[PDB]
Design a protein around this ligand. Sequence first.
Ligand SMILES: C/C(=C/CC/C(C)=C/CC/C(C)=C/CC[C@]1(C)CCc2cc(O)cc(C)c2O1)C(=O)O
Ligand SMILES: C/C(=C\CC/C(C)=C/CC[C@]1(C)CCc2cc(O)cc(C)c2O1)CC/C=C(\C)C(=O)O
Lengths: 289, 280
Amino acid sequence: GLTEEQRMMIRELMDAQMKTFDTTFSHFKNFRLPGVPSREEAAKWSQVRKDLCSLKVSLQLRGEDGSVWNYKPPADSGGKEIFSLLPHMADMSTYMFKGIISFAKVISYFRDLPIEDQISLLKGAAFELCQLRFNTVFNAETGTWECGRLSYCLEFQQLLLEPMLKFHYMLKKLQLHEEEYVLMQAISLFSPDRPGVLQHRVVDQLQEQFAITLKSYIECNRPQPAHRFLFLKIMAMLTELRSINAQHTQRLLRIQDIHPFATPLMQELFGITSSLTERHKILHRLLQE
Amino acid sequence: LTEEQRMMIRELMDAQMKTFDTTFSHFKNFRLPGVKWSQVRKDLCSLKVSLQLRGEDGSVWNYKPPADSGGKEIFSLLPHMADMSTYMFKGIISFAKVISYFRDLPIEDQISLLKGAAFELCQLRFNTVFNAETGTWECGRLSYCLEFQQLLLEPMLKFHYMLKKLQLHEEEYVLMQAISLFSPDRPGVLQHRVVDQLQEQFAITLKSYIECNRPQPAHRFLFLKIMAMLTELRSINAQHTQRLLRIQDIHPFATPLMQELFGILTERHKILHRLLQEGS
Ligand SMILES: C/C(=C/CC/C(C)=C/CC/C(C)=C/CC[C@]1(C)CCc2cc(O)cc(C)c2O1)C(=O)O
Ligand SMILES: C/C(=C\CC/C(C)=C/CC[C@]1(C)CCc2cc(O)cc(C)c2O1)CC/C=C(\C)C(=O)O
């Protein structure tokens, strides 16, 4: 079985996930909706089209009363068309990040870290934990993220070429337990090599204890040896996600540059314009309640 | 065709072109569905549509309406429909105003003719953008799609299918509009005799137009079919007015212009009087 700390550490993470993951998105509200050239400035746009080309979704909003609003995005011509959903998605991301921040605040091991490292970790990990939560509401038969009354539907070996999409299919294929998802979130959260992390050694030892807990959970709770390598598959998914995160940051900056849309909290997280707390005032304030 | 008949068709066609914006480009700022009772429900059930909105950029918003669970949700599309009806009624008012035979009537009979015919002329115009294969009224960037033997038992829907089959020319539609507009026997019409003689010359002109243009055996009796169609449209009008009043009673939604036209002299129709006093 699992040691006592390991059982308690899982309890604390499941508690924190229960308290801060709105699995029905009931409190996502007030979001924006799509309404009813220099030589190297046009090079920028052709690059931004290469960014958004495989990540195209339609949007469904189911009303209380039974009605359905459905938004199909425009085909790419050239110009503003390809950003029509970006304000909405910025609002969804921002709402997901607030739940990630609250998730981190709840965890004793994250609390007892110095505020500047809390900022650097969340800055490094927020997109990754958002993707991990999104995977739990991904329906891989229909290519759809089911977010309560909202749904994002993709529009298939071409699809499996975009790393972000191949990540969700593969991770979904593993059929992980809630406990495995929440330990994945902790391992990603406590990554000792995020930019600006000063307490490398404490964060490294925290991560390894979460990884050891997950390794033992799998040995104890799944029918060995059919799941002989599940732990290592999960670690490889996290490594791929760390790279998807880097790709996504650069994509977001390119888009932001030619078409601003990121929220103030997204600006802080992704480095969009003194010390670390002065350049992260929102994030800092959210950590202190 | 006479010279007076060629002229009259020319004026009606020119009036239609000036006042029927078939791309609906200038329909904007309308309400959208948010993001006794046993009889009101009999009314709205066969007349169920979804709504489509194609944006300039190529994007599409679709609204599928809720199924009935005995609530106010059966009325979600009514504010929007009222706005569309109100844009169409203003186009119909402009159409009547550029016709010389109508401009010349007393302001009083202008008001009564428009009260009596605005719905009919709107349905005739709607019929020219009706796609009968897909059950859709294609109004530019907006489309209204019917949610079949069950449907053909709703008289307003049967009217649209039967009229489309006749395959009328623009000239026949606009003459239908004129014959319907100049009905002598509308409530409040004083100059019965004048209106009747105008109605008769539009009907004679349609009959002659149909003979100088439609030789095929597929079009035998076309003029009489059209006229019977106009009589059915007048009955559909009276039924639509009853439905509209019931629903307004348990759930207001009518625009001020609709309230004037449907009854919810010149003094009590301020908006019509004003629009009729404005130029073209
Ligand atoms: C708004 C935004 C823009 C960053 C630039 C890119 C690459 C956007 C495409 C992102 C996209 C279509 C992702 C679909 C995949 C999931 C896995 C699907 C659901 C979802 C909802 C969101 O609200 C945000 C994201 C990223 C998201 O990705 C952001 O990154 O915030
Ligand atoms: C029958 C009824 C409403 C539904 C009428 C309906 C859904 C009709 C569909 C058929 C056409 C033939 C198609 C499109 C359309 C658009 C409109 O904007 C108005 C109407 C009547 C209309 O009917 C009574 C209330 C009157 C209203 C809302 C009005 O009079 O608005």
